Design a protein around this ligand. Structure first.
Ligand SMILES: Nc1ncnc2c1ncn2[C@@H]1O[C@H](COP(=O)(O)O)[C@@H](O)[C@H]1O
Ligand SMILES: [Mn+2]
Ligand SMILES: [Mn+2]
Length: 200
């Protein structure tokens, strides 16, 4: 087969960037919140959510963080905080039609960190409830391992290598990481893979 029927109407590709430092800052805070809505059958990008987020606990970005992500201070200054961004996300979900119980969608991330560690950890820190659509997801490294029969070593770069795909955009940009995840998904579906929830 090729581009088989999938179990979901849409895939929501997500890749946070967060405050960081050498050695690691504590706690980390989300500073970039991108979502790509993919057509569930063809994997084409149909809509994009993208907001930078103002960190509060450590409001000044370290030089390491800027070097790593490309995100400069003026991009987060004046932005809403995570709480407001999470409400913007919910409105975006509603307008996309994804809050319909008969429309099936699922988040896709490179690894488990984004939705297993980063978002629940910051939300608990903030005393915010986590929306239920953030609680199931597909780990692309785990899906790739089932599709290709091997464990990639360095996330997106090694998955692009095994699939002979040219990298899209700037590494460690949240939105560009999402596009690479989208591109890998399209190739896995081209090869006939059917995606399944991996989160426990
Ligand atoms: N090499 C690194 N050193 C320190 N922190 C990192 C590194 N790579 C990623 N991070 C942190 O993890 C976040 C997610 O990056 P990634 O998982 O590569 O998309 C970044 O925004 C940083 O906060
Ligand atoms: Mn990531
Ligand atoms: Mn990233």
């Amino acid at each position: 087969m090729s581009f088989p029927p999938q179990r979901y109407h849409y895939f929501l590709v997500l890749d946070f960037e967060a405050t960081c430092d050498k050695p690691q800052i504590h706690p980390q805070e989300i500073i970039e919140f991108p979502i790509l809505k993919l057509n569930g059958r063809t994997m084409e990008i149909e809509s994009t959510f993208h907001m930078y987020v103002q960190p509060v606990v450590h409001p000044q970005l370290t030089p390491f963080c800027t070097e790593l992500t490309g995100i400069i201070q003026a991009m987060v200054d004046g932005q809403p905080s995570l709480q407001q961004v999470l409400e913007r996300v919910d409105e975006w979900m509603a307008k996309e039609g994804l809050l319909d119980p008969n429309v099936k969608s699922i988040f896709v991330t490179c690894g488990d960190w984004d939705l297993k560690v980063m978002l629940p950890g910051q939300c608990q820190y903030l005393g915010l409830p986590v929306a239920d659509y953030f609680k199931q997801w597909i780990n692309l490294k785990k899906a790739y391992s089932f599709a290709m029969g091997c464990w990639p070593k360095n996330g997106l770069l090694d998955m692009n290598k095994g699939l002979s795909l040219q990298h899209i955009g700037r590494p460690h940009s949240g939105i560009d990481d999402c596009k690479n995840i989208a591109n890998i998904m399209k190739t896995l579906a081209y090869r006939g893979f059917i995606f399944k929830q991996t989160s426990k």
